Design a binder for these strands. Structure first.
Lengths: 83, 80, 82, 95, 383, 73, 106, 162
RNA sequence: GGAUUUUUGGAGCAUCGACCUGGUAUUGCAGUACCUCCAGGAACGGUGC
């Protein structure tokens, strides 16, 4: 089946989320489409490269193997899946 | 036979699970699943070169655990 | 069993693999050790790198955080559900 | 079933873990290396397909730098080791 | 304040209540070892509290020798008593009775049926001072000491039976050297054995036993406690013999024996005291060590199943019948009724008759459906 | 065993970042269910200013952490 | 009931320091227009006032802490345990005597 | 009504507007602050609005606390053991107090990590050279009464009371 | 329940966030990586090698 954090990450598409890479890079952008394997496709991403240097990249795609965390916006806090 | 079934049949045993990143939690293991998830109560956790803190409840994952330490009063013939 | 669902929606602190600790209200979980922490705050310890410097911990709040099971090490309860 | 159990017994008696089958035949001590450079020498009571071992009366030795590092060792009565941290398992140790 | 009159009487009453609680605890029979150990710990805590109360009451006698001249004087008297009665003439508007003057120490020194623990000893637990393998004083845990001895000896040729046989010796030859690193493990073993002896008997005087052990170590063990027939007199610190008592007395104050060695009486005195304490704990608790060795032999000789067995020890009926419907009856003090048929059955009952008898209306059939008091009074006056 | 949604990045010049500080850029020619990418005109950029041409490279999914599309996609 | 208990304790403290049976600090207070209903033996509080006066007289004993110090009850747990065992034996003897009296009555 | 652990456990603890954990305790009228150790260092801001606390003392050892809100109170005296209980205090809101003398802010310089201070709507600010004495007492404070410190003000503070 | 995305293991330099001084235009209604620019000092700190 599908997990409840997986469903929360799939329902968070279209809003401004922030994924975290395994090397310490945090990319914040609008999640266009998500997958069940934590594949985060985000537009207008802001890469940090673990040094604070935030560069503006377009159409970024981070895989689920390096995705350490996914900060979702507070608009999805009242979702019925989390109850 | 898999070794997860021997670890799942353990309740109210004061074990010591040493994690991968220099962490060691000694406590009474209250729950074990097929994915080696160890849920313990009233445990003491000591990290790498840190002070041993005490927690009322802890839930360590299977992939994060490196080794386990069982007491001497535990037969292995009946658990296998 | 259902030992992971007994501590749901409570103020729990999960220790990461890099040494950080994320404290938040873990409302949703899954079989892949994932966690949905509402109003989460991540605290990471910094090295002193000196002889007289102390060890500090920088804490930053992120809100709703979806933490995967590949980075989570151990989770402990810290506070009751408000 | 019974055929899968017979295939698992054949793979444990004639495969790569057959030296581990030497640990449960004559109760000989094996030396397993860990990911944290801690070598554990001891008898293996139970094993599995995922290299998860149950050690009885094991001795774990490692090198800890305080200079020159010392060989600080410990002795555990009963222990369990997962197969993810097992690097190299030697059937017949030197000492 | 009446420190010599009221406080001394209160301390004597508290000591009498503690003695009565101790007599009631000693008179009751015991059924389990853990409950007996908990009762012994509660009795030891009550004895310590009574000793602290007696020490607090025994120090309140400095001003009593100065106040006894004014208290025993017959020239004084009712003047200060009338002044104290005028001081105690305050407002008595606090209408509250306090029977807990003597009943509260009687209830604090007692236990409940659900939990046999006193009120100061409500937070005490036997699982915080003893392990599960010890059995609340039944056996002694020796697996960690055997593991430490195997780690110190650096050899795998010593099992639990060999460690129990090496630990059973009291005045024989040791297994290792006296100046080696085994003394650091022996001091920890003695510190564990002292805590095990103090936990196995909490009602015994540990300070008097420690003073007697120190007196036996100073007066007897330091002056040749093991005579012979080099074999005549042996020293525990220097580990050397003596020809006679005069040679040992001359060599006791020698320069290598005082501080000119690595095992003299200056640095190795604490190790010798720990060895003497371990010998006294082995001699006093030899039966517990024999029971632990027998339990270890029974656990080793058993199979896996025997060791595992030893280690484990309705809305439809309320809606169809007209129930759950609020009805008010103003005759019987505006009571509530949850049904029309229930109110019709309670109208010809004893409660409605007792409610109607206060107004003076007789119990008849005309006032069956009467609810208001004014309508019932008008129906009684019309007839 | 579901394949990733790499249809928009197909036949487009992007730049991926491998593990250990490695980074390459090229045109994605295909996709795999194990997140393995095929890059044509691959130019690997080291810590120095020089870039090494590879021609045709095959990157696995266990090393690829991120990939930014340099085109409109 | 705190004021009446305090008045009874004050009367027991003032009556225990008397040098005679009738020449006390409470017999002259009855003639000094002070209402004290606890002095008469017809009341139920007189049985508690007599016990309070007995405790005040026993608190003035020479081994009660006025000119001496108790050592067996304050510095010997074995003596307290022997006293508790003697009290338990006396209670068992009293229970056996009560059972014998009940058997004789039956 | 005295403050206890039941009033702190039943209070609403949530996320504030400064992205920190804050527990609301407004409308309590607690005369003394005590038994505040039941939070287990899981809060960063403690609000004490509309309280009758005469003295700000009796605070347990809390290392996670970084903001103190004691506005709308009747605090006349200040405690001395405040630096040993809150080592990571950064914000102090002591507005609308009963401070009259300048000696009440002398333990307030004991906090080394303090940077934000608010002593507005107080009789201590009506006296002359109050801001200069507050700058000379605690030099680590960067924001005093919603105003940054000045170099000329620091020079006047170092020149005065020599 | 063992084969790449979760669970039987890859184990002195650059950058960013601050701190303090002066000139400068915007006086404006909104749910946020970050928002005016220049000049001077710093004996502040995190991350990677």
């Amino acid at each position: 089946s599908i997990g409840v954090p997986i469903k929360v990450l799939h329902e968070a598409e279209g809003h401004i989320v922030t994924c975290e890479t395994n090397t310490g890079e945090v990319y914040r952008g609008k999640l266009i489409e998500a997958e069940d394997n934590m594949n985060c496709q985000m537009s207008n991403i802001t890469v940090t490269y673990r040094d604070g240097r935030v560069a503006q990249l377009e159409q970024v795609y981070i895989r689920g193997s390096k995705i350490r965390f996914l900060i979702l916006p507070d608009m999805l806090k009242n979702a019925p899946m989390l109850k | 036979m898999k070794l997860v079934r021997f670890l799942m049949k353990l309740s109210h045993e004061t074990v010591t699970i040493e994690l991968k990143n220099g962490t060691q939690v000694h406590g009474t293991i209250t729950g074990v699943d097929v994915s080696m998830n160890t849920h313990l109560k009233a445990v003491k956790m000591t990290l790498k070169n840190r002070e041993p803190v005490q927690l009322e409840t802890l839930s360590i994952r299977g992939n994060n655990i490196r080794y386990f330490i069982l007491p001497d009063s535990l037969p292995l013939d009946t658990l296998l | 069993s259902s030992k992971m669902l007994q501590h749901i929606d409570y103020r729990m602190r999960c220790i990461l693999q890099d040494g950080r600790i994320f404290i938040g209200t873990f409302k949703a979980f899954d079989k892949h050790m994932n966690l949905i922490l509402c109003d989460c705050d991540e605290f990471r310890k910094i090295k002193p790198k000196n002889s007289k410097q102390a060890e500090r911990e920088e804490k930053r709040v992120l809100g709703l955080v979806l933490l995967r099971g590949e980075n989570l090490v151990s989770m402990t309860v810290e506070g009751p559900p408000p | 079933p019974e055929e899968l159990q017979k295939r698992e017994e054949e793979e444990f008696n004639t495969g790569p873990l057959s030296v581990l089958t030497q640990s449960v035949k004559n109760n000989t001590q094996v030396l397993i290396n860990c990911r944290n450079n801690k070598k554990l020498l001891g008898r293996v009571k139970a094993f599995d397909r995922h290299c998860n071992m149950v050690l009885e009366n094991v001795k774990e030795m490692w090198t800890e730098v305080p200079s020159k590092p010392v060989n600080k060792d410990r002795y555990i009565s009963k222990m369990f080791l997962r197969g993810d941290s097992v690097i190299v398992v030697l059937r017949n140790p030197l000492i | 304040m009446e420190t010599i009159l009221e406080q001394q009487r209160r301390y004597h009453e508290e000591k009498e209540r503690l003695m009565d609680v101790m007599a009631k605890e000693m008179l009751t029979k015991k059924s389990t070892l853990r409950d007996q150990i908990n009762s012994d710990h509660r009795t030891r805590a009550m004895q310590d509290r009574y000793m602290e109360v007696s020490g607090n009451l025994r120090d309140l006698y400095d001003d009593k020798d100065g106040l006894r001249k004014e208290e025993l004087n017959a020239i004084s008297g009712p003047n200060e008593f009338a002044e104290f009665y005028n001081r105690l003439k305050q407002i008595k508007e606090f209408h509250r009775k306090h029977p807990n003057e003597i009943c509260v120490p009687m209830s604090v020194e007692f236990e409940e049926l659900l939990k046999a623990r006193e009120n100061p000893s409500e937070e005490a637990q036997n699982l915080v001072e003893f392990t599960d393998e010890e059995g609340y004083g039944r056996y002694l845990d020796l697996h960690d000491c055997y593991l430490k001895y195997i780690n110190l000896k650096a050899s795998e040729k010593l099992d639990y039976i060999t460690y129990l046989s090496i630990f059973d010796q009291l005045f024989d030859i040791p297994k290792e050297r006296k100046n080696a690193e085994y003394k650091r493990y022996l001091e920890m073993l003695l510190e564990y054995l002292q805590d095990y002896t103090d936990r196995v008997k909490p009602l015994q005087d540990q300070n008097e036993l420690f003073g007697k052990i120190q007196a036996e170590f100073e007066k007897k063990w330091e002056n040749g406690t093991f005579p012979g027939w080099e074999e005549r007199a042996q020293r525990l610190f220097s580990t050397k013999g003596k020809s006679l008592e005069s040679l040992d007395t001359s060599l006791f104050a020698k320069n290598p024996k005082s501080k000119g060695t690595k095992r003299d009486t200056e640095r190795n005195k604490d190790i010798a005291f720990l060895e003497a304490q371990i010998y006294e704990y082995v001699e006093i608790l030899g039966e517990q060590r024999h029971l632990t060795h027998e339990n270890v032999q029974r656990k080793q000789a058993r199979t896996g199943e025997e060791r595992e067995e030893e280690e484990e020890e309705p809305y439809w009926l309320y809606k169809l019948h007209g129930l759950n419907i609020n009805y008010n009856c103003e005759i019987c003090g505006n009571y509530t009724y949850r049904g029309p048929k229930a109110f019709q059955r309670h109208f010809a009952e004893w409660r409605h008759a007792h409610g109607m008898r206060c107004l003076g209306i007789p119990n008849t059939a005309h006032f069956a459906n009467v609810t208001q008091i004014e309508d019932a009074v008008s129906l009684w006056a019309k007839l | 065993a579901h394949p990733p949604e790499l249809k928009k990045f197909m036949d487009k010049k992007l730049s991926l970042k491998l593990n250990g500080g490695r980074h390459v850029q090229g045109i994605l020619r295909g996709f795999d269910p194990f997140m393995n990418l095929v890059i044509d005109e691959c130019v690997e950029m080291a810590t120095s200013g020089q870039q090494n041409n590879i021609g045709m490279v095959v990157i696995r999914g266990n090393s690829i952490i991120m990939l930014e599309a340099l085109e409109r996609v | 009931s705190a004021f009446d208990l305090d008045v009874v304790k004050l009367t027991a403290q003032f009556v225990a320091r008397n040098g005679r049976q009738f020449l006390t600090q409470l017999m002259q207070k009855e003639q000094r227009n002070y209402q004290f209903d606890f002095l008469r033996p017809q009341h139920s509080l007189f049985n508690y006032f007599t016990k309070l006066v007995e405790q005040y007289t026993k608190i003035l004993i020479p081994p009660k802490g006025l000119f001496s110090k108790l050592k067996k009850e304050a510095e010997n747990p074995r003596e307290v345990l022997d006293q508790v065992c003697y009290r338990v034996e006396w209670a068992k003897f009293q229970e056996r005597e009560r059972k014998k009296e009940e058997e004789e009555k039956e | 009504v005295k403050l206890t652990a039941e009033l702190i456990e039943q209070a609403a603890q949530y996320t504030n507007a400064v992205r920190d954990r804050e527990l609301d305790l407004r409308g309590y009228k607690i005369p003394v602050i005590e038994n505040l150790g039941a939070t287990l260092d899981q809060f960063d801001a403690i609000d004490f609005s509309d309280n009758e606390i005469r003295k700000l003392d009796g605070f347990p050892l809390l290392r996670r606390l970084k903001t103190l809100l004691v506005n709308n109170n009747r605090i006349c005296r200040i405690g001395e053991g405040l630096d040993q209980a809150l080592p990571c205090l950064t914000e102090l809101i002591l507005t609308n107090n009963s401070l009259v003398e300048l000696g009440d802010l002398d333990p307030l310089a004991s906090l080394k990590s303090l940077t934000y201070l608010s002593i507005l709507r107080n009789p201590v600010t009506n006296k002359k050279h109050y801001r200069l004495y507050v700058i000379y007492k605690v030099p680590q404070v960067r924001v005093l009464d919603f105003q940054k410190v000045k170099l000329k003000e620091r020079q006047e503070a170092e020149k005065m009371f020599k």
